[PDB]
Amino acid sequence: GHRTLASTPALWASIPCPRSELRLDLVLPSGQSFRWREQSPAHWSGVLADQVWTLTQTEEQLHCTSQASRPTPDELEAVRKYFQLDVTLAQLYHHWGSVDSHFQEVAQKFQGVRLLRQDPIECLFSFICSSNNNIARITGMVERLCQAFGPRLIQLDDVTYHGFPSLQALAGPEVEAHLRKLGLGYRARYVSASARAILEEQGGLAWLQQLRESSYEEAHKALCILPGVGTQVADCICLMALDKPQAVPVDVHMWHIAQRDYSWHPTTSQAKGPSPQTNKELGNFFRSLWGPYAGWAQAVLFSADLR
Amino acid sequence: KTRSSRAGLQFPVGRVHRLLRKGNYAERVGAGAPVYLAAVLEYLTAEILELAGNAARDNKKTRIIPRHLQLAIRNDEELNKLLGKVTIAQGGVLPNIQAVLLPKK
Amino acid sequence: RAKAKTRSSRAGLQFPVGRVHRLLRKGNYAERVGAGAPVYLAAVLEYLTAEILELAGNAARDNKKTRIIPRHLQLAIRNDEELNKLLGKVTIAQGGVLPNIQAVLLPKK
Amino acid sequence: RKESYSVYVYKVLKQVHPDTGISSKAMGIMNSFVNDIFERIAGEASRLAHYNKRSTITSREIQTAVRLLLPGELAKHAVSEGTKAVTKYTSS
Amino acid sequence: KRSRKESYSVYVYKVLKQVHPDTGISSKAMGIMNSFVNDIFERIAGEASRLAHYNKRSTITSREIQTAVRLLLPGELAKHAVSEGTKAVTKYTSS
Amino acid sequence: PHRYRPGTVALREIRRYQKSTELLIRKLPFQRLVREIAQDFKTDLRFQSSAVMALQEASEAYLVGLFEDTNLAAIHAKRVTIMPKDIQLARRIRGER
Amino acid sequence: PHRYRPGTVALREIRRYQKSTELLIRKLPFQRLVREIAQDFKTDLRFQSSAVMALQEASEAYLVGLFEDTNLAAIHAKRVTIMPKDIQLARRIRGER
Amino acid sequence: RDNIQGITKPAIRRLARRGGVKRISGLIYEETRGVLKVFLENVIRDAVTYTEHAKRKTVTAMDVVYALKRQGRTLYGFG
Amino acid sequence: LRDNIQGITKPAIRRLARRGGVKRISGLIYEETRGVLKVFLENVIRDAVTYTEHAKRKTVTAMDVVYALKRQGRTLYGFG
DNA sequence: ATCGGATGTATAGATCTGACACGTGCCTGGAGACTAGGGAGTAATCCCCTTGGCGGTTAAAACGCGGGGGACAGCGCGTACGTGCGTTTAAGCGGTGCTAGAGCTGTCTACGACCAATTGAGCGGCCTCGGCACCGGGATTCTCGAT
DNA sequence: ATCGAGAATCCCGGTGCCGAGGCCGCTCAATTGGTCGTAGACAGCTCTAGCACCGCTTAAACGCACGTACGCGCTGTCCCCCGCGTTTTAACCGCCAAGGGGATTACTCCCTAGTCTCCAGGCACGTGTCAGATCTATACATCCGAT
């Protein structure tokens, strides 16, 4: 079964990390990644760097674990990179708090909300399933998508973990029809259609991976081409999988936050409600308010608004 | 010489042709149109008058009165349809009684 | 020749006056048509259009629909008494019927 | 100098019943009937001419107006009588 | 080209936006409005033509259209229509 | 003495008035009613005699037609007597109101 | 089990077909009927699809109006079922008979 | 100056008899007076309006015939 | 073509009655309304075909049907 | 009124899309500006016909009973029509292929508008007499108790 | 369950009487010739949408098995609308007056048809910009059989 810090002590390794720098309960189930489950209280399990892990935290430490031994230093580095631990959240909160008193009020109660370094492919298809949907549902869809087309890893209790599907697999024959039986709705083709476009028209995996060196403007532009990947989804990918920290998603949640917490309204736009250019304007508004890491500040308020 | 006699009619072709133009029903009017209209008017008048004369003779009267016209109109299922939504003044109604009203035997 | 100004705007109108005047000429209604008759008629037409469009917009807002469909037009005509009297003998294409059930048909408690 | 069809209705009455008379009280109804039928036919002929973008009222227009207004059995005889009359008028 | 076919679409659209500046209208509704305005135009014009013939007149002035409006439009609808139409005629006469 | 069973005299006068062609309505009360109604639309209105006569003929023709329709409704409802339900059913189905 | 009472699935779908705005009759059978009727007046006639649609819509409106009048006539006779006698009564009152 | 009561009870009975009616209820004797008043108002409205358009002060029979024809109840015998 | 009035099935009549506010249906209603529909369609199609023939055409357009309904007394909006 | 199943609506970290809105090219129908003649407004006037009045007359409307027959409520029966479930079926949709005639243009003709002269017909106007309404007497049809 | 008394309604005969209809003058609109202008009859060409077929999906029609609610026949009650006698009252009906307004005549003057330039409002068409719908799970709200 799933390990716990108390049951198999000699299988856990720690990483210096204060709760002020990271709160797993505020990051893993908040819509960034849909692959983590609190199988046991305060213990989150999921796939990280092609293998299963269980993570749990004390006050100043982040504890990590057919493994038959404690995580190695090399493996632990995989975890630090996933949580981008070289970035000091305390410095970011300070800055955002200094230029936005509302953020300061919220930030007092929701510390440790950071951003996850992610894999481009997993991020692209998970958010293609994020559209017009709720986190609870999205989570199920992504799980069934991985069980059906992803590599089988290991089994803990009655849970069999799977790696994320490859482009070749998602581009396979009759994938759409399968995913509709798996309840993906119309997003089923979006998945099939985007895998093929990438493989047969954009120059495969290399095309998506190269975007990480490209500019936010370029990257976002490149992604909007893919079926199911309009402005909100593209920004999600840029921010969470392509290292574009200034990329601000503009969903219903950030729509409400802007309105009630900043009394914001479109000025350059035409419409008074959500539209492609009002959404674009809201994004710039947040960028001019918080700066270069505006997307990360967005992640904090979004997580807090879920609560 | 008269266009009524020349067409073998009794209704005035000239008068119908005047009324057709004065009434400005269209910019122009044909020559056979008043003749055709006069013929139709004559035939309808003959039909009404023939049934009215029969109805008047049925009641031993050699003079036609509006009651005879109403009886003749209502006794023909085609002419009644043609004049379904119109009233003959002092024409009365068609005598009928529903069978339920009639006394028990 | 001065700046060209339409007769519809001289009368502060929206429905056309030249078009209505031409139609009156070409409909063979009478030999001559007065100058003010097309203006009046256009005013009556625009008022009636504004009335029906007001009712249709209210019906559309009640149904939370931004655009106006024939169903809203038919419902607006049937709800208002005067317009229903005006358009009693007129069928609206795919307009539907006014929702009503006779009280006798309803169940007993 | 009002104008009425009393003379023509009387002539038709003499043709259909040589020994029966008509009261002027009903002859007024005859006038108001022939005038009404004339108005009803000419109105449909005018609409026909305007419908087909035409500007002339012809025998075809009147015949179609009759075919539209009068019912089956009466309209067949009306059409036949009109056709015979116009044929005779053209032949003469 | 498909010939000059004269429709009231633009005028109806202008009235609709002057009444509710943020509501669109479908093509079926414009077709119905076009048929409606043509029907009412034919009805009022025919009635006024009948008035012109009855009074043995020769022209259709404003007051025959006024009388036709009072015959056709029921009650307060006719009242409002006459009032606004006389407003428009006075505005037109004042150039 | 001699008393007719009820209904037989009620079936009589039906034949009499169907064969009849008079007006069945007193002329002066109807003329005064017409003038009273015309006051609501204009003061000091004159009427030709033939105008009042035509109004009378049209009014009674309409009333007889309405009574025929209500009679059809009355027999239809397994009844013999007219009730205001019949007047209103006939007016509504005909489309008057 | 689960069985509904006969009064419910009537008012249900009465509300539905008063809210909705379909045509309620399959298009092709009506088209073939129109063709067959038009055969008697002329042979080898070709109907514009809009003409068939207009005929269908007008027939739907006429039949719904007739059914409303028939329901009123049925309710007048202390009945909730429409009988044919209701249909010819409504037609007779309206003037179609 | 109420004059609707001039349409007496026996005249209403006579009209119903011509309609072909055996028995009349009491409430008819006022319901049909109301109906007749409504119809006369509707017709005389158009008649007086025609008189106004023609700028006369007498209501001719021809105006009544026109008004009746406008409502679909054409009348023969006067014009 | 023959025997096409049966194409208007009993469920179609039931749906029409339900739209018309009718709660419950007898048995002879279907035959009676098929007869009524035949009569009404004959009445409108005769005038439509007459309108078409007067224009020397072999195609019955929606415009002629609209004019025929206007004469019949329905004045159908929408089409043209 | 209460309660557990059936339905119905709002919503959920967006996206697509057939329909609509809008911009623009381009003409053709509306405007501006003149004249011409006649339709309509206006002043004067005359008759007639609608309004108002009075007095006799009596037909018809109001009123009051007696009663009986028809509306109405209740009630039992029975059956047929609503409802649900499984089984055909042909409606509907997408696609392809073909051509009948709908819809335009082009030309020229013959058919109707229009005007001048002519003449007869069908409209007021007037006078007669016979078809028809009315009164009365008598023959005989339906109704309603007697038996 | 079929006859007389009694109204009641035709049949017939006499008796006025006032419209129906036959002449008569006439004058204004129908008829006839002739000229000129353009609506459309006839030819001809294009293309489009109506028809015809065909394969596949699947919502919808059909048929059969229930079972309970509604149509209908039957009884009993009571009430209110008939038929009829009696009283009144207001409508008919014959006069009278009388003057308001509808019709008619003769100016006369502005108002709209007709025509010729001249131009921009609206139509046709080509791109942006979207409101409705979207698969399905879920959180409620709402209705309905059973209690």
Numbering used by the authors:
A (entry chain K): 12 to 76, 83 to 324
B (entry chain C): 15 to 119
C (entry chain G): 11 to 119
D (entry chain D): 33 to 124
E (entry chain H): 30 to 124
F (entry chain E), G (entry chain A): 38 to 134
H (entry chain F): 23 to 101
I (entry chain B): 22 to 101
Give me lines lifted from the publication on this model.
Mutations caused by oxidative damage are primarily prevented by the activity of base excision repair (BER), which eliminates 8-oxoG in duplex DNA. Cryo-EM structures of OGG1 bound to nucleosomes containing 8-oxoG revealed the enzyme uses a DNA sculpting and base flipping mechanism for repairing 8-oxoG in the nucleosome, providing a mechanistic basis for the elevated mutational density at bases facing the histone octamer.
In the OGG1-8-oxoG-NCP − 6 substrate recognition complex, OGG1 is engaged with ~5 base pairs of nucleosomal DNA at SHL − 6, which buries ~1086 Å2 of surface area. The interaction of OGG1 with the nucleosomal DNA is mediated by a network of non-specific interactions with the phosphate backbone of the damaged nucleosomal DNA strand, as well as extensive contacts with the orphan cytosine and 8-oxoG (B C). Interestingly, we did not observe a direct interaction between OGG1 and the histone octamer, indicating that nucleosome binding by OGG1 is primarily driven by the interactions with nucleosomal DNA. At the center of the OGG1 binding footprint lies the nucleosomal 8-oxoG, which has been evicted from the DNA helix and positioned into the OGG1 active site. To position the 8-oxoG into the catalytic active site, OGG1 binding induces significant structural changes in the nucleosomal DNA during 8-oxoG recognition. These structural changes include a 1 bp register shift in the nucleosomal DNA, significant minor groove widening at SHL − 6, and nucleosomal DNA bending around SHL − 5.5 to SHL − 6.5 when compared to 8-oxoG-NCP − 6. The OGG1-induced minor groove widening and nucleosomal DNA bending facilitate extrusion of the 8-oxoG from the nucleosomal DNA into the OGG1 active site.
